[PDB]
Paper text:
We report studies on the reaction of cefiderocol and the related cephalosporins ceftazidime and cefepime with Pseudomonas aeruginosa PBP3, including inhibition measurements, protein observed mass spectrometry, and X-ray crystallography. PBP3 transpeptidases are proposed to be key targets for the cephalosporins and most other β-lactam antibiotics. Inhibition of PBP3 elicits transcription of genes involved in the SOS response, ultimately leading to cell cycle arrest. Consequently, PBP3 is one of the most validated and clinically important antibacterial targets.
The cephalosporin cefiderocol (Fetroja©), which was developed by Shionogi, is a pioneering example of a ‘Trojan horse’ class antibiotic: its C3′ linked catechol group acts as a siderophore enabling it to efficiently enter Gram-negative cells via the iron/siderophore transport system. The three cephalosporins form analogous 3-exomethylene products with P. aeruginosa PBP3 following elimination of the C3′ side chain. pIC50 and kinact/Ki measurements with isolated PBP3 imply ceftazidime and cefiderocol react less efficiently than cefepime and, in particular, meropenem with P. aeruginosa PBP3. The C7 oxime linked carboxylic acids of cefiderocol/ceftazidime bind identically, directly interacting with the guanidino group of Arg440, being positioned to form two salt bridges (∼2.6–3.4 Å). The C7 aminothiazole moiety appears to form identical interactions in both the cefepime and cefiderocol/ceftazidime structures. The aminothiazole amine NH2 forms hydrogen bonds with both the side chain carbonyl oxygen of Glu242 (∼3.1–3.6 Å) and the backbone carbonyl oxygen of Arg440 (∼2.8–2.9 Å). With the cephalosporin complex structures, the C7 amide oxygen is positioned to interact via a hydrogen bond with the side chain amide NH2 of Asn302 (∼2.8–3.0 Å). With cefiderocol, a small amount of cefiderocol modified PBP3 was observed, however, most of the observed complex was meropenem modified PBP3. The kinact/Ki of cefepime was slightly less than that of meropenem (9600 and 11 000 M−1 s−1, respectively), whilst the kinact/Ki values of cefiderocol and ceftazidime were similar and substantially lower (3000 and 3400 M−1 s−1, respectively). Given that the siderophore group of cefiderocol is lost on reaction with PBP3, it is also of interest to explore whether this affects resistance, including by using analogues of cefiderocol where such loss cannot occur.
Author numbering: 1 to 244, 245A, 246 to 442, 451 to 517
Amino acid sequence: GGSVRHIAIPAHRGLITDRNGEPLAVSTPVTTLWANPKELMTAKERWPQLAAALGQDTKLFADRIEQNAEREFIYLVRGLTPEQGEGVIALKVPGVYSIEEFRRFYPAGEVVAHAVGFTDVDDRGREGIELAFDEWLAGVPGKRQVLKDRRGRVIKDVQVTKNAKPGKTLALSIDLRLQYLAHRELRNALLENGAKAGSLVIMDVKTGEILAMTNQPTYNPNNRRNLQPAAMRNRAMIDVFEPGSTVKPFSMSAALASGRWKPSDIVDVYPGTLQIGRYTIRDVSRNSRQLDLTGILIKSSNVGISKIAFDIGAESIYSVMQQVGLGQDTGLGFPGERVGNLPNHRKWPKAETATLAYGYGLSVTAIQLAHAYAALANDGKSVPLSMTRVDRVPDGVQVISPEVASTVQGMLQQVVEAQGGVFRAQVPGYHAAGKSGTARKVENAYRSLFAGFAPATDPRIAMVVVIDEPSKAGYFGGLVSAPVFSKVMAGALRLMNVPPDNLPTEFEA
Ligand SMILES: *C(=O)[C@@H](NC(=O)/C(=N\OC(C)(C)C(=O)O)c1csc(N)n1)[C@@H]1N=C(C(=O)O)C(=C)CS1
């Protein structure tokens, strides 16, 4: 008797590690109890003890078997241990079977949840890297021939028709050591400032690798019960924000490349406002008259960068921001990753020219902002982004001339180190460079920004800190986000064994 059939052989999903082999997503065995209701219907006397062993009410269990009597497979319980999936088998109930199946476990939990994502109950990638690289990780199921009786019970294992092929190991660009550091410090900053959310991205300016990518709020992917959908957002890639003052270095790059501006050139920003018809550009610090181009960045003068933009024209500024990737497709293919928006016009009036120049009305992601600062730090050369470990670095694209990029770098080192600058971004033992931003959202709500890189002498790491809606008295990016940059950069440089470059001169010793 019986009918010849073919069942599948599940394939083992590939391991995801960090760049150094630390496990991030591992498919490990769990014991699962299943039943063939067609066989169970022949052993009704065994049902009550089976229900009791499974923690089910006898009536509800009997009803469930009756309501599935025409199926040949139902799950009884999933995710037990081999010891537990034997105490039920010890009842020797016909139609009850125990199997070992592989299910994802995430050893770092909430720390890398947004990057890694997760799989569904069938071990298929559903979010994050698990989805983006599902074909790589999934493998290919096998198949084997069986003989099944009239109730669907496998009577004979005949022969394997096709072997299963396991999925492939995938090493991410993430450095788990930096990820933990970034995760902890971003969390600390949210509580320090009573903020609603935040992101922090760390990039290797030489290889394009995303070394760390963390957000708050986050979630435990090992316990996705009653989860908030907002807690699962990889904000660094799928949320957009106005970068504000953090794009002024790119406006400055266009100014320097125009041949009309040098760093020691002077702009008059008195009295701290500039009327453009019915629109008024305003500075926070309004006790300045003449400022040089570095002072414009140190004071973060919207007036100053606006007058420069009028002189060189918006088109030159738009082109730099486009070339460094702001509002442009990263090409990475992360699920839900946003392109943002760099607004364009046929003709640029003064209002649109100024707002472009100081980052108002633009939409970027944290990844884009970090990649743009990586290109600035890398002497103007943009190495393509990667979420996976890069062994052979692809050729970069020269997006800012090396001379202009070097000059802007030095200016941003002064933003961090000069008198009146963003001193909380200073990294002990190293020269650091960057730019703060503070964006008013549409009571006033704010987004606090800092973007930078280090060491200034030979840049290695670019970093972006975004703090969404700090609720304490402090909200400027130089107060809220810069100290996070300092702590995380200091730890990252130490972990990567980068030599300290802030050493005394011969006369300052
Ligand atoms: C750069 O980001 C500048 N920011 C702004 O002009 C914006 N808002 O300014 C404040 C004072 C927060 C306002 O309430 O108007 C802005 C840009 S895009 C958007 N939606 N709002 C200057 N940046 C800093 C800094 O962090 O370095 C300052 C100290 C002065 S404002």
